[PDB]
Amino acid sequence: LGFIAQSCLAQGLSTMLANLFSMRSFIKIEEDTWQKYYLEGVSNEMYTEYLSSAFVGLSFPTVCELCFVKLKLLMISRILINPGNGTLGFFIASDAKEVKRAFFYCKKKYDSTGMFHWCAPKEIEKVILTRSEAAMTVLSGHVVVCIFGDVSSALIGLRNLVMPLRASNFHYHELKHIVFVGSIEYLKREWETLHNFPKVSILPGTPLSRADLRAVNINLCDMCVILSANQNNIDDTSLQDKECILASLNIKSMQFDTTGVNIPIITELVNDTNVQFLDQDDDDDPDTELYLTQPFACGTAFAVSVLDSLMSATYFNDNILTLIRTLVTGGATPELEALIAEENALRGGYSTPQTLANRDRCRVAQLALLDGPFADLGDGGCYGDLFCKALKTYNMLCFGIYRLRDAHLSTPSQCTKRYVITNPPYEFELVPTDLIFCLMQFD
Amino acid sequence: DDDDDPDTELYLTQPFACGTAFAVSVLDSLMSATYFNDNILTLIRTLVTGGATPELEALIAEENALRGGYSTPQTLANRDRC
Amino acid sequence: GPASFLVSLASCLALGSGLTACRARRRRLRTAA
Amino acid sequence: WLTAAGFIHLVENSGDPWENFQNNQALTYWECVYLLMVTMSTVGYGDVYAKTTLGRLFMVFFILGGLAMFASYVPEIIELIGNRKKYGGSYSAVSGRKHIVVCGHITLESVSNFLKDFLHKDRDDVNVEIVFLHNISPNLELEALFKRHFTQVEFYQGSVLNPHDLARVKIESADACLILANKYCADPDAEDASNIMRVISIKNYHPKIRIITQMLQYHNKAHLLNIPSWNWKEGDDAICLAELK
Amino acid sequence: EVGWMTSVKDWAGVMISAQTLTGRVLVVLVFALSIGALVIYFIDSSNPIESCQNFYKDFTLQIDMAFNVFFLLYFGLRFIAANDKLWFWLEVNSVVDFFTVPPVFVSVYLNRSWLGLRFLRALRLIQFSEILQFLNILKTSNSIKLVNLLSIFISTWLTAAGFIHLVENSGDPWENFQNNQALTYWECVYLLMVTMSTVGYGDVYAKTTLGRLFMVFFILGGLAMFASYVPEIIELIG
Ligand SMILES: [Ca+2]
Ligand SMILES: [Ca+2]
Numbered sequence A: 001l002g003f004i005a006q007s008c009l010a011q012g013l014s015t016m017l018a019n020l021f022s023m024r025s026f027i028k029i030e031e032d033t034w035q036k037y038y039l040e041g042v043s044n045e046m047y048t049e050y051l052s053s054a055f056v057g058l059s060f061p062t063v064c065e066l067c068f069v070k071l072k073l074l075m076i077s078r079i080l081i082n083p084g085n086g087t088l089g090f091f092i093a094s095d096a097k098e099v100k101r102a103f104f105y106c107k108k109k110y111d112s113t114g115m116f117h118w119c120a121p122k123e124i125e126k127v128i129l130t131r132s133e134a135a136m137t138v139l140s141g142h143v144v145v146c147i148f149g150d151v152s153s154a155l156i157g158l159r160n161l162v163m164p165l166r167a168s169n170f171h172y173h174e175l176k177h178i179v180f181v182g183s184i185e186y187l188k189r190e191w192e193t194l195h196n197f198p199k200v201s202i203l204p205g206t207p208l209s210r211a212d213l214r215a216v217n218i219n220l221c222d223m224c225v226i227l228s229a230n231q232n233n234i235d236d237t238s239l240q241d242k243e244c245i246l247a248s249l250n251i252k253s254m255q256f257d258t259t260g261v262n263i264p265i266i267t268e269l270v271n272d273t274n275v276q277f278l279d280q281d282d283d284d285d286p287d288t289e290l291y292l293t294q295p296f297a298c299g300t301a302f303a304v305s306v307l308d309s310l311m312s313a314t315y316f317n318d319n320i321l322t323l324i325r326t327l328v329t330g331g332a333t334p335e336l337e338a339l340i341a342e343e344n345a346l347r348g349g350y351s352t353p354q355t356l357a358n359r360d361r362c363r364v365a366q367l368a369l370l371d372g373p374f375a376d377l378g379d380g381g382c383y384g385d386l387f388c389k390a391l392k393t394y395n396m397l398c399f400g401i402y403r404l405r406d407a408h409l410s411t412p413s414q415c416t417k418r419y420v421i422t423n424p425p426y427e428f429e430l431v432p433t434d435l436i437f438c439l440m441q442f443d
Numbered sequence B: 001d002d003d004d005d006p007d008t009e010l011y012l013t014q015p016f017a018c019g020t021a022f023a024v025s026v027l028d029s030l031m032s033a034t035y036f037n038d039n040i041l042t043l044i045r046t047l048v049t050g051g052a053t054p055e056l057e058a059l060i061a062e063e064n065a066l067r068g069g070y071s072t073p074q075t076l077a078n079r080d081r082c
Numbered sequence C: 001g002p003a004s005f006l007v008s009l010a011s012c013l014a015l016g017s018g019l020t021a022c023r024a025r026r027r028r029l030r031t032a033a
Numbered sequence D: 001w002l003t004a005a006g007f008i009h010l011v012e013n014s015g016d017p018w019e020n021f022q023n024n025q026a027l028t029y030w031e032c033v034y035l036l037m038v039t040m041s042t043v044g045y046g047d048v049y050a051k052t053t054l055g056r057l058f059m060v061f062f063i064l065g066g067l068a069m070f071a072s073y074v075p076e077i078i079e080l081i082g083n084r085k086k087y088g089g090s091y092s093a094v095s096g097r098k099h100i101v102v103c104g105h106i107t108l109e110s111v112s113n114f115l116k117d118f119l120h121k122d123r124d125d126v127n128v129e130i131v132f133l134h135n136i137s138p139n140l141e142l143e144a145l146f147k148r149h150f151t152q153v154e155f156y157q158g159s160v161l162n163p164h165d166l167a168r169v170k171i172e173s174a175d176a177c178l179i180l181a182n183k184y185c186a187d188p189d190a191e192d193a194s195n196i197m198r199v200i201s202i203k204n205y206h207p208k209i210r211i212i213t214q215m216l217q218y219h220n221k222a223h224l225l226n227i228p229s230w231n232w233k234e235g236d237d238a239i240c241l242a243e244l245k
Numbered sequence E: 001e002v003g004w005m006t007s008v009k010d011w012a013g014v015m016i017s018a019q020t021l022t023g024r025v026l027v028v029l030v031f032a033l034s035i036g037a038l039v040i041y042f043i044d045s046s047n048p049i050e051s052c053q054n055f056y057k058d059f060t061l062q063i064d065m066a067f068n069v070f071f072l073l074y075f076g077l078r079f080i081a082a083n084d085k086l087w088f089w090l091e092v093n094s095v096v097d098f099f100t101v102p103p104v105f106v107s108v109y110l111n112r113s114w115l116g117l118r119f120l121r122a123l124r125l126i127q128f129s130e131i132l133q134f135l136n137i138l139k140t141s142n143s144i145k146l147v148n149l150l151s152i153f154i155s156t157w158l159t160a161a162g163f164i165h166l167v168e169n170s171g172d173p174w175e176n177f178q179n180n181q182a183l184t185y186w187e188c189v190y191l192l193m194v195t196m197s198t199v200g201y202g203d204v205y206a207k208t209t210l211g212r213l214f215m216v217f218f219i220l221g222g223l224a225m226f227a228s229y230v231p232e233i234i235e236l237i238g
């Protein structure tokens, strides 16, 4: 759910986050396709390494930026992400052989803590909506969650989905509205924990209904999430996510006053085989792995099977798991774990100067390229200059490139799906139509 | 008041021949007729269930609930069906 | 062996082609009748 | 087998020591192999047998451990060798003759009814070849029915969900795809679900193909309209049996 | 047009099946002449391994020539209608045709008859369930399975007995054919029945090196066949 929410904040983040943990060796293909560039980003894994004595001098932060040219590697006492303003460097090196180059080379508004947002409890009747008011209410760039459930269905737990979207550096004006569509009985069952959350709406019905989706302004939503809970009841392989897929398709097949095929929608699949049904303009082979599938590479698909590699990475150095918990789901401060353990219900209080000071966290964001002062680097032909300028001007580091699938071909196309690139090489050509992953700071 | 033999087919049975019996098994032959020229299925849909106009299919798809409005001269003109 | 097998195969193919040709013109040339 | 045969050869050629090696039967190694094969197979011709005291003792102590071994290994070895896919391979696309693919609920009665209605002499002289695609291998009755339609139908065992099996039946040149439905089911929703899956799976491989299918409910038929490539204009069909009934 | 090769392939496929009167006649003729060839091999078994017989002064050789000519024509018809040529070449009926017809042709040419692989004609007995299913006589699953089991069992039994007869009558070549046991075909049938039934009286048995080798390699594949077919055949009959 944290990866899903991260993808909602910035599309394609879940795919690269999952790929950063799986150990993949470098592979090359002769043909020039979209997979050729994608496979150059999956080769980068998440590592932990100590710093050198050359970087322990006047200041830890100022040396971190712009030093990646010499080291040819990326950097990301305590948990440190984009350190601005003995330390374990969270690297994105492609292998453990060349990661030994840092130390070796020497030339009531908030919650009880302020990590999230809190508001007065709400009653289920004060948030239940209807097609009349849902269409009347205006929603743009919001979050829509399609929930499948029944009377005897299992419990997913939506508290971990709205939590990542309500971080400290997310202002109330910038907070993304979340609306849940599905059976009201399931939401009533989950309402015991889903009541201290602000800016939430629930529309009864089913996600398979076009009118209910039309009411909640699906066309202009920032991200559509398809989730299911009944898959633990049926044991038939063919029938499993036989659901979810139909809805993803109805979403794609809708027609507005344009077609909804380009609507950003992410689907959770329990069976990895069903992913071939997500897209029709792609090669479907059961032999290929999930990470090679186009819908997964584009950030529109996610499965729990890619998280099984987390155990091996966690074992070798445990610092990664807490880094994951502070990179997704907002932040898992030691105190918050105890508070959740003892009350099992998030509560807040009056803010303090130190409470507001707990806001220096930098969170992910998606940046365009068509407009901005950095337009000179839109087609500069060198990716390294782009992130060097980002670091040396506005203090922002980019994970990589969110690139169009058909941008590699000279002829134009109407394709909209974009796949993820993690840490492109220094001599990497750029395209004017592109999206940039970044860790924006607070203000 | 009829001869009951398990060997005989449903279409030969007196209650079915008199229109007092119906089963979904007689509709399995619809696929073969539909394949050879598809115009029959829409002819079936316009001969039974009143009429399946292209617009009505979309309206049922999007709201899943039949609704009406004020009539128009062209709306009343859509009545020449026999 | 092989020569007799080839002769039998050629005879079968010729008989089939001749029968097909005879039936074809018997059927088409008399479609109206 | 070889170790027992070698031990018998050594014992029979080299007589028992307490008899001053005076029981040399002069048995070749191949003869001992044959004797071991006969003895552990329970047949026991008796033309070749052990005569020395040690040979008879080893035969007695080897019968118990070898008869069971033979009876438990030979049929099982045959069973593992016989594991094969009878209805494999792909379909060859013949030029000038269109073919259709039929999948879904395939059964002796349904297939027979479809064949007798599709291939009736009442229709015009049209030569369309039917290719079946089912996961479960046909039984003797269904194979016998297919034999009576030797030049008109073919069967290929496989799953419609697998894109490889769809390429095996060559849907690229197929005229139409036909999906039968299990009307007499205990869960119409589940049957419509599986069928909507094939609908999709077929669409994912080749959107351009036309589909004639049976739906037991009207809401599932409405859900079929949500499929992106539900091109009913050029050709597509969805017979709702409940609606038509 | 529509393909001349496809037209003749479809014509042969219709002819092989019993879909037309000519097809049914050909199928019945194949059945009858397979039975007749088996009977002819049974009669000719009493003759020595090698002999000289005049084609135009003998009554059996002419009938055998007609039978194998018809079998050659049927093989050609099957080959025209065959889907895959390589896998049709490896079928059991094709192999027995290849090892049965050319030797009789050579025997007619050379005026000298050798009882070699003529026992393979019993393998033609296998293709009987397909013959009955083409004629629509055999429909129900139980009877189809019973006919399949009976045909396979009898064909394998007769083929093994014929191979034993050939091997025992014609001694191993490396011993200058000095191991002629002089076993009648009925005696070989009895020996095969006894051996695959596990009983093993031992009064009749193979003494040649090739005969013992075939017995060893046939016990494994025949004891299981007998034990799995005879009780099951009895069950379907009952
Ligand atoms: Ca790597
Ligand atoms: Ca696909």
Ligand SMILES: [Mg+2]
Binding pocket: D129, D150, D151, D152, D153, D154
């Ligand atoms: Mg065919």
